[PDB]
Design a binder for this molecule. Structure first.
Ligand SMILES: Nc1ccn([C@@H]2O[C@H](CO)[C@@H](O)[C@H]2O)c(=O)n1
Lengths: 442, 440
């Protein structure tokens, strides 16, 4: 019965016609309910790969995936500001979320950051926060709602009932060569975030060797596609192209990135590239969330909550609300686990850093124990890199490539070989590039 | 003496404990030379700081080695030693079919199980609805049953991970139950003491699940898989549904009747079939009895459908001193409740939700389970013909048939069932029986 209706929808898309909202939602729910077979899913996916989808179709697909599970509704809490979030294609050393949420919350936004785990070398935000003893990434949503109401930000992982149709849909795409389709990718990127019930959203689309899309042109095209769909779905959205040709923060790992985020919020250390990207993303959130009129007003408000400690305090109150220690901001080195062996790694040659393989550095952290080879693995939260050298730095015997935090000497030596191999020196200094490239609006 | 507080202080400060330190502490728990205060402190340090995989493995193996560990190599059996463990449910009768099904496909299944706890049934209590059935054969009769029949379902000794006894007893009064490394070591220690070649874990999801949320159930399943494989036992886990009763009955005798009729083919609840079959598949694959899913299910369907599995079950019941002809004549042996009547809902919607925790407690209150260890059980009481999530409910379709001792307990059970089952005008979203498979 459903199989009959499904095949008509396939035939309709097969022949180049646009599907209706009602047909798209029927098919997405049949994927969710297992009333449409894998063959039929693959066939539809392949007709979309070939014929593409119009903007109304793309919007219907994303909203249907979004409506396939829980969608958070914030009206009853009567918050007096915008619900807003950031989404990213990810990167090594990208810890922006841990400062951005508190900074926007301190400026009057409400930031329900539902995120995830590792996924294949880039480090998941949830694993980083679990380096904090006691920190609880799975509050029940009455606690979640309370934290959003009281603190303005929470970072959690209750994702199971969010856009569940994407699960079966992606699984079939990934064995039938129908992953590589912009309308399907856009749906997968957006559905879970949109299920947060956002007023506004900023999308961070990486550019560079360490990016999800491999070329500048393809990053830009993906960002425009996301922006078009998200706004069509009723969420005020912009995107930034930002640089991932090297580690973004000065550290890569879990505990080490939490430490960097606290020091950024307090002013103890602000990596200038991480600062550029974080500030730029937060600006979009204030403008789209209607908390600031323009860039200069938004940057003033953001710099103010960095300067008077309010953003650091929101982070501290979030850590305490999610059951970490109440004095984490003041005493983070007491609570974050320390690796047994912390030792700088030096290059074999002298010269300038001209290039860096971020996927390889990310895999080096994973191999140290800082990430999961398999999902059943346990993370050592103390290991990783700090003091990362950057593109353009002078490297000699007195200037290390990084400080490696390792659980023992054997894994330290293995990480050092991987780091030295991932970083390319050259006799002449490279040219500089922006940390933030194009801002993309609808 | 002194080392125990040093071990506590080390973990309090966020440092990892070594294998030597963990084995010391566990043995001290078993020997009763480490006090309740020191147990609880260490548990609270673990709750705050968690444990690495080497610590989790050390902990689990230390608890396993704190008592008897079975060894099957000397009997040289021509198949793998495999078993299943579940976090428990209501109507979770899978073991009674799964044991025989796997034994009929070449596995050896030393199922050392347990009784009911809280709201969930216990496999051993269900089997004791069978007259004569002896859940405590000596080591001798136990080995011979495994050797000659391939499966036996029994209760455990004092020397089966005894360290867990004081450890769990302290956790349960100090709010240190809710720790995945502690839970994992508690779940696995007793199962790995069986000397298994392979193991499958059934981790329930939903309103009757041990963990409250899907992501917590998922986290637990992953941890168990990591530790069990790290302990040298090929292990996988399934996330299965417990947002309603799994079988069509809940109780003891009524669930034994359902298991027999499933094995013979008289009646097979399709959700119960999915979960049972899926669990058996893992055992055949992990035990190297089948190359893949399709070959495993083909072997399993075959023994369900040529009577071999039902026959193995009857041999097992007879070997453990139940009747020779229990499969053929179960109605002659299982006890009948005094009062058996259908219960009807008050509204006319679709079944949207089911509070399985409350259903399970309703069975306990009828006398089908225990509140204290010393309680006795009426094996005849319980529910049959359970309505299911998504069914259309009107005045001609009951929520269940309630089997009770007398009209008063029948009324009480009917109030609990009507309260536990929520009807709605709209058909709910479909829930699957198996949410995912988790391997290493
Ligand atoms: N693969 C995984 C994933 C999670 N966990 C455990 O789950 C709890 C919360 O994430 C934490 O206790 C964490 O250790 C785990 O043990 N293994």
């Amino acid at each position: 019965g459903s199989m009959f209706l499904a095949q008509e929808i396939i035939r309709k898309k097969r022949d180049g016609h646009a599907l209706s909202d009602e047909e798209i939602r029927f098919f997405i729910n049949g994927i969710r309910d297992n009333t449409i077979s894998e063959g039929q899913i693959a066939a539809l996916a392949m007709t979309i790969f070939f014929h593409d989808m119009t903007m109304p179709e793309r919007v219907s697909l994303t909203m249907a995936m979004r409506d396939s599970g829980t969608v958070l509704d914030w009206k009853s809490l009567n918050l007096n500001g915008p619900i807003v979030d950031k989404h990213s294609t990810g990167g090594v050393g990208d810890v922006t979320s841990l400062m951005l949420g508190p900074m926007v919350a301190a400026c009057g936004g409400y930031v329900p950051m539902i995120s995830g785990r590792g996924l294949g070398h880039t480090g998941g935000t949830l694993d980083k926060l679990e380096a904090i003893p006691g920190f609880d990434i799975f509050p029940d949503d009455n606690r979640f709602r309370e934290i959003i109401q009281d603190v303005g930000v929470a970072i959690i992982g209750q994702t199971s009932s969010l856009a569940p149709a994407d699960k079966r849909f992606y699984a079939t795409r990934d064995i039938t060569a129908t992953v590589d389709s912009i309308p399907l990718i856009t749906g997968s990127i957006l559905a879970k975030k949109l299920a947060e019930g956002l007023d506004a959203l900023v999308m961070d689309v990486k550019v560079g060797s360490g990016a999800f899309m491999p070329t500048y042109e393809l990053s830009e095209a993906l960002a425009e596609a996301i922006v078009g769909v998200a706004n069509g779905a009723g969420v005020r959205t912009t995107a930034l192209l930002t640089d991932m040709n090297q580690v973004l923060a000065s550290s890569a790992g879990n505990a080490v990135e939490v430490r960097e985020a606290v020091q950024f919020l307090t002013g103890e250390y602000r990596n200038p590239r991480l600062f550029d990207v974080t500030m730029a993303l937060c600006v979009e959130m204030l403008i789209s969330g209607q908390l600031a009129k323009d860039d200069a007003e938004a940057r003033a408000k953001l710099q103010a909550v960095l300067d008077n400690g309010k953003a650091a305090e929101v982070f501290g109150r979030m850590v305490a609300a999610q059951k970490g220690p109440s004095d984490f901001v003041e005493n983070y080195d007491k609570y974050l686990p320390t690796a047994m062996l912390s030792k700088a790694v030096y290059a074999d040659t002298e010269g300038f850093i001209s290039a860096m393989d971020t996927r390889a550095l990310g895999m080096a952290v994973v191999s140290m124990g800082g990430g999961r080879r398999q999902a059943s693995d346990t993370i050592d939260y103390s290991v990783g890199f700090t003091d990362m050298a950057r593109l353009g730095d002078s490297i000699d015997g007195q200037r290390p490539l990084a400080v490696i935090h390792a659980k023992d000497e054997a894994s330290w030596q293995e990480a050092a070989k991987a780091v030295k191999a991932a970083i390319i020196l050259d006799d002449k200094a490279p040219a500089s590039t922006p940390s933030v490239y194009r801002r993309i609006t609808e």
